[PDB]
């Protein structure tokens, strides 16, 4: 009856940004009050809708994308942005309708000595299309000489671990991100507010 936002926002494990997770939300009641009655979210912005009116809205389907990046990169989770994350990992369309939510997760995703399980794609031949997901692990040929399955100069592996230490600067600390996409189809609305 009520939409399972707890499985998304309160999940104990989050995906790497290059392999970002998507959950479809449908046929339920959406109560976004948890976004208001909380001084814990660091980013809560919407595009195409008013963020204070979410409980008054209905949609055919809602899609929740979640992943971890570092604080300095949260600004790239927006339409028209540029950078490693927006270009190679997770890109929003220009006509994006939905909301972007983020919060500091240093207490969950950083470890003494460092947590390196979260990865991001560092090299790619071209930018992603909006909502495209690339999980390939081909050696990146930076130069003109083929690599022949061997790494070295101008032959790199495309993924790179984040280095999340508890004592990192807040810009280098891990942040958990949730992107809500609102979809309208020629069909009855199955995700409404209270």
């Amino acid at each position, epitope marked *: 009856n009520l939409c399972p936002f707890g499985e998304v926002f309160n999940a104990t494990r989050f995906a790497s940004v290059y392999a970002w997770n998507r959950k479809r939300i449908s046929n339920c009641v959406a109560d976004y009050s948890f976004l208001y009655n909380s001084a814990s979210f660091s980013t809560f912005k919407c595009y195409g809708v008013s963020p204070t009116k979410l409980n008054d809205l209905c949609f055919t389907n809602v899609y929740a994308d979640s992943f971890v990046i570092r604080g300095d990169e949260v600004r790239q989770i927006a339409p028209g942005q540029t950078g490693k994350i927006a270009d190679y990992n997770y890109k929003l369309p220009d006509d994006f309708t939905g909301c972007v939510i983020a919060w500091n997760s240093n207490n969950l995703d950083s470890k003494v000595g460092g947590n*390196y399980n979260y990865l991001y794609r560092l*090299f790619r031949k071209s930018n992603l299309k909006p909502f495209e997901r690339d999980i390939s692990t081909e050696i990146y040929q930076a130069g003109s000489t083929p690599c022949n399955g*061997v*790494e*070295g*100069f101008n032959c790199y*592996f495309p993924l*790179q*671990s984040y280095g999340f230490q508890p004592t990192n600067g807040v810009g280098y600390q891990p942040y958990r991100v949730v992107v809500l996409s609102f979809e309208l189809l020629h069909a009855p609305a199955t995700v409404c507010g209270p």
Partner: nanobody
Amino acid sequence: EVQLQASGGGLVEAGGSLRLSCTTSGLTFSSVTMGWFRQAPGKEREFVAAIRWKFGNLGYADSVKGRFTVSRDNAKNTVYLQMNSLKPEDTAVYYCAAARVGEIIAVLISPSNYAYWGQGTQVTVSS
């Protein structure tokens, strides 16, 4: 308390061969990318070879490709560098190096991607 201990090396003639080994203590070796660098007297430290722990790829400097072979035995916490067809320009101090536990490093040739360094082993190839 993380320690890298190397064995092998020494003096050979041109065309000879060697085998270096490097054993770690205090690390989960099976989740650590291992590497070999070298430094000639007066010159800068340069990349030689590397072997990944998760994605299996090997890495080699262009000058040693085809002559050197890097390998690893996780059960013995050991990484190996077989150096065949040695040239005089291979003379240097060779350093074993290790990245961090679970870390996925993209660029194998960058020394800053390795956190633990061995003491170094002399390799001389004359005439």
